[PDB]
Amino acid sequence: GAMVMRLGDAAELCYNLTSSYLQIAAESDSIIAQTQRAINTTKSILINETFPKWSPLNGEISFSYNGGKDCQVLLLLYLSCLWEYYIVKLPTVFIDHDDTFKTLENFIEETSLRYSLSLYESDRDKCETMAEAFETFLQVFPETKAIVIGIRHTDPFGEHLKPIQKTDANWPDFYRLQPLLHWNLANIWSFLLYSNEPICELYRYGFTSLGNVEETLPNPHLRKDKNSTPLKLNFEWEIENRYKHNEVTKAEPIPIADEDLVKIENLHEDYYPGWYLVDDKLERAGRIKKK
């Protein structure tokens, strides 16, 4: 049971859950309303600024997908916008690394099958920079004009970015399409939880940012401790009223890899899941101390 949707069914599903989220009753100072506003901005960037210029059907656009929560939100929104643009397999690139979490590798494969992506992966056993990996990608796919990237302004290297922006001089020449820049961490959790799509299950165990296996720990701000003030959940409504699937769209979480559970159990500590963190400044706090 692999939870596979043909691309059109995936796009329609994403349109429907996004539309459903936009119909949620919320007040003007809520996280849900802020997320609705962020969705509307993303939709305008894609439908008004992107698709009229570059074709998402003929290989002009590739989607950079790394399995993390930001890329996943953006992929759901991108699929929704394809459906909206055209009605109302997908070329995908993953820059792989030798120090990626196994659960994340598993999740990228599972989602490629779920959403009918056409996945290209760079070679994890080659020592090369991201720019170099993308140069090789462009040799394989020379028709590529633009690449969708799921970065936010609060991420490292996120400050000096715009929604439509040519690449750096040492990259292959393409336009970066960056439609998620204005999203905040709380918006990411709200939408992802409401969507009821499978997500990388490391977040369930207290990770808030999936860096590499050597540096990344569950977030210490989420550690359970009798003598801390208990954390409160900001996403109760979304979780309790999450989007209901049907026979075609039915899915399930996939458990973390055996090796990742061993690493988490060896900590002898328990954590709230990642969606108990809403401060963007602390997203990357779960990290081995280095000199």
Binding site for Cl ion (CB under 5 A): 68, 209-210
Q: Which residue type does 45 have?
A: I
Please check whether residue 41 is in contact with residue 104, taking contact to mean a CB–CB distance below 8 angstroms: no
Name the residue nearer to Cl ion (CB basis): 93 or 210: 210
Residues 6+ apart with CB under 8 A from 3: 110, 113, 114, 198, 250, 251, 252
Residue among 83 and 275 whose Cβ is closer to Cl ion: 275
Our CB check for Cl ion shows the closer of 82 and 95 to be 95
Residue type, 42: T
Q: How far is the CB of 222 from Cl ion (least distance, A)?
A: 14
CB of 93 to Cl ion, least distance (A): 18
138/148 with CB nearer Cl ion: 148
Our CB check for Cl ion shows the closer of 146 and 185 to be 185
Q: Residue with CB nearest Cl ion?
A: 68
Structure tokens at 126: 């080659």
Q: Is 22 helix (H, G, I), strand (E, B) or coil?
A: helix
Within a 10 A sphere around the Cβ of 91, how many other Cβ atoms?
20
Shortest Å distance, C-beta 277 to Cl ion: 11
Q: Which is nearer to Cl ion, 56 or 68 (CB)?
A: 68
CA angle 253, 220, 273 (to 5 degrees): 20
Chain centre distance of CA 124 = 20
CA neighbor of 152 nearest in space, from 270, 71, 36: 71
CB of 268 to Cl ion, least distance (A): 24
Q: Which residues pair with 118 in a beta bridge?
A: 91
Three-class secondary structure of residue 231 per DSSP: coil
Q: How far is the CB of 69 from Cl ion (least distance, A)?
A: 5
Query: To the nearest whole angstrom, how small is the minimum distance from the Cβ of residue 214 to Cl ion?
Result: 16
